């Protein structure tokens, strides 16, 4: 799903997606693309799509 | 052996390449100094020989090339000109062509002495030929002791040609 992670998001939920995203980023032997993308998702979520946030 | 490593480094290379540039200038200054010539023929020729010898082996050729041989040669501008353009004239032609034969041998030797093919050396030599083309062509026909020097120069270019990607082959 790295390229579309909405599907993961939908089924699993946002929190879980974030957690997995963190693991992929940290995960060792991974391609830079994967780690960077996961880092990007973790940090910024999906641009103009899913936003990453504290809500009152 | 031994030397290649030591010598390399230092010193010599740097100094000797710079001295190539100055070699061109030194051939002109050559007329004057015909006299101070005696000194220097004993030395300048010896320098060319030293350079040629280093080129004959793999490690030596690498050091010369690293020193930026092609650059100094471009700077000397020995090749990027026509000798005929311009003492009894046949003597000056013999002398100038003479310088050209040794430098050309040094270039050919450096080229072949690496892996002349896909290697970087092949590319550098081709640039040498194309940039100094028409001299190669011009060299091909005529005579005298001057012819003898001319003949040797012609062979040297031919060796450079085939040794590289065939200068002709490249010029498809």
């Amino acid at each position: 799903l790295l390229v579309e992670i909405e599907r993961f998001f939908k089924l699993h939920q946002e929190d879980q997606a974030c957690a997995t995203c963190l693991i992929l980023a940290c995960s060792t032997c991974d391609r830079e693309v994967s780690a960077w993308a996961t880092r990007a998702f973790f940090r910024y979520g999906g641009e103009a799509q899913m936003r990453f946030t504290t809500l009152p | 052996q031994q030397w290649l490593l030591y010598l390399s480094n230092s010193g010599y290379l740097k100094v000797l390449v710079d001295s190539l540039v100055e070699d061109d200038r030194t051939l002109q200054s050559l007329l004057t100094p015909q006299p101070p010539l005696l000194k220097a023929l004993y030395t300048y020729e010896s320098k060319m020989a030293f350079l040629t010898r280093v080129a004959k082996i793999q490690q030596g050729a690498l050091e010369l090339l690293r020193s930026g041989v092609i650059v100094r040669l471009a700077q000397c501008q020995v090749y990027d000109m026509r000798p005929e353009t311009d003492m009894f004239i046949p003597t000056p032609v013999d002398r100038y062509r003479q310088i050209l034969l040794p430098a050309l041998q040094l270039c050919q030797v450096i080229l072949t002495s690496s892996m002349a093919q896909h290697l970087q050396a092949a590319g550098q030599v081709l640039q040498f030929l194309i940039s100094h083309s028409d001299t190669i062509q011009a060299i091909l026909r005529c005579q005298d002791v001057s012819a003898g020097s001319l003949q040797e120069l012609a062979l040297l270019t031919g060796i450079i040609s085939k040794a590289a990607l065939p200068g002709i082959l490249s010029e498809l």
Binding site: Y44, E47, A48, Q49 | I70, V71, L73, A74, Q75, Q77, V78, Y79, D80, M81, L126, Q127, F128, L129, I130, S131, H132, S133, D134, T135, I136, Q137, A138, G167, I168, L169, S170, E171, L172
Partner: protein
């Protein structure tokens, strides 16, 4: 005709003269032989360039005529042809062709000239090689433009082609249609000297003219120098440029001119070139370069009609956004564009790219992360432009 150098009127006579030499057989060949001899004598005249051309042309033809061996056996090639032709080249016989070609009864002229142009390929190859080899060796590693141009006879020939063939696709097709020209092109492709290489790129651009020709040019690089090599060259130059922080401008400008010409006249193929020059071209744009505008023009050609605009928009936003610091106001945003798009060419290129991308679509929440998102700041930038326009230089 001699008692004309500049006078354009000379062109009117070229049809008759080109065709006349073409039909040398008609003459006798006691007469043809006499002309040949007279011409060699006539090498006295450097001032008349156009005499030099026409004579050179006659030679290109004569060689073919000598095919009936009665004539050929009689003559010695070195003395009879090569020496004279070489003299003519030295006396700027190619230069004036280039002039005839550049400064383009059209049918008679085009037909007769294209016959001339082709005759030179097939019959002449010895001369081409002689010149090419001559050129490679001549220069030595402060060259003035005049010094660069002196020996440039081969490149001039390539330009001759470029001007004559340009538009005209009809003529251009001849090159591509069968796999000697096709040989010529392969041959030209081989010439490595940076200047020959750049003119080769330009000549091909001219050849690329029809939607049909463009397709062949696409295949020429792709299948039977490859497109990849081309981008590689661009990539290498990019590194050298940045690591460092005229010759290159010549080469690069030509590289871009060519990519532009084909990408414009192409179809599904556009995506293929797009993915590949797109990434490299983007990188080149980041560098200052004089050139910026030109790559933008090429990029635009690459831009596809559909959804897959996104890579391009990101490049553009990233390539305005990156340096700029944007406060939370509007002006800072304008500044981002102004800083990057410093010169006139840069802007015109930018406008062409933008015109293309804006044609029908872009990504949502563009610029997300870095800045206040959305397309709006780009339009603001135009305030900088068409506000200013009134005060151009230069209509």
């Amino acid at each position: 005709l001699e008692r004309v150098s500049l006078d354009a009127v000379n062109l009117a006579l070229l049809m008759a003269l080109l065709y006349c030499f073409d039909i040398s057989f008609i003459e006798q060949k006691q007469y043809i032989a006499t002309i040949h001899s007279r011409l060699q004598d006539s090498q006295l005249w450097k001032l008349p360039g156009l005499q030099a051309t026409v004579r050179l042309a006659w030679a290109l033809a004569l060689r073919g005529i000598s095919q009936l061996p009665d004539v050929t056996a009689l003559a010695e090639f070195t003395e009879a042809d090569e020496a004279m032709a070489e003299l003519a080249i030295a006396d700027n016989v190619f230069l004036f062709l280039m002039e005839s070609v550049v400064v383009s009864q059209e049918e008679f002229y085009i037909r007769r000239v294209h016959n001339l142009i082709t005759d030179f390929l097939a019959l002449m190859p010895m001369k081409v090689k002689q010149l090419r080899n001559r050129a490679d060796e001549d220069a030595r590693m402060m060259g003035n433009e005049p010094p660069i141009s002196l020996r440039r006879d081969l490149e001039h020939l390539m330009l001759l082609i470029g001007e004559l063939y340009k538009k005209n696709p009809e003529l251009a097709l001849e090159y591509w249609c069968p796999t000697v020209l096709s040989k010529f092109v392969r041959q030209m492709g081989d010439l490595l000297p940076p200047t020959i290489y750049i003119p080769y790129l330009k000549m091909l651009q001219g050849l690329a003219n029809g939607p049909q020709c463009a397709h062949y040019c696409f295949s020429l690089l792709k299948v039977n120098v490859s497109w990849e090599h081309f981008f590689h060259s661009l990539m290498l130059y990019h590194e050298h440029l940045r690591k460092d922080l005229q010759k290159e401008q010549d080469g690069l400008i030509a590289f871009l001119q060519l990519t532009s010409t084909i990408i414009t006249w192409s179809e599904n193929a556009r995506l293929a070139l797009c993915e590949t020059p797109v990434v490299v071209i983007l990188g080149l744009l980041q560098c200052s370069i004089p050139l910026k505008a030109e790559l933008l023009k090429t990029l635009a050609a690459f831009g596809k009609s559909p959804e897959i605009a996104a890579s391009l928009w990101q490049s553009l936003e990233y390539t305005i956004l990156q340096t700029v610091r944007i406060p939370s106001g509007i002006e800072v945003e304008l500044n981002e564009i102004e800083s990057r798009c410093e010169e006139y060419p840069l802007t015109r290129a930018f406008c062409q790219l933008i015109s293309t991308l804006v044609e029908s679509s872009f990504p949502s929440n563009l610029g997300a992360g870095l800045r206040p998102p959305g397309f709006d700041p780009y339009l603001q930038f135009l305030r900088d432009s068409v506000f200013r326009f009134r005060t151009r230089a230069r209509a």
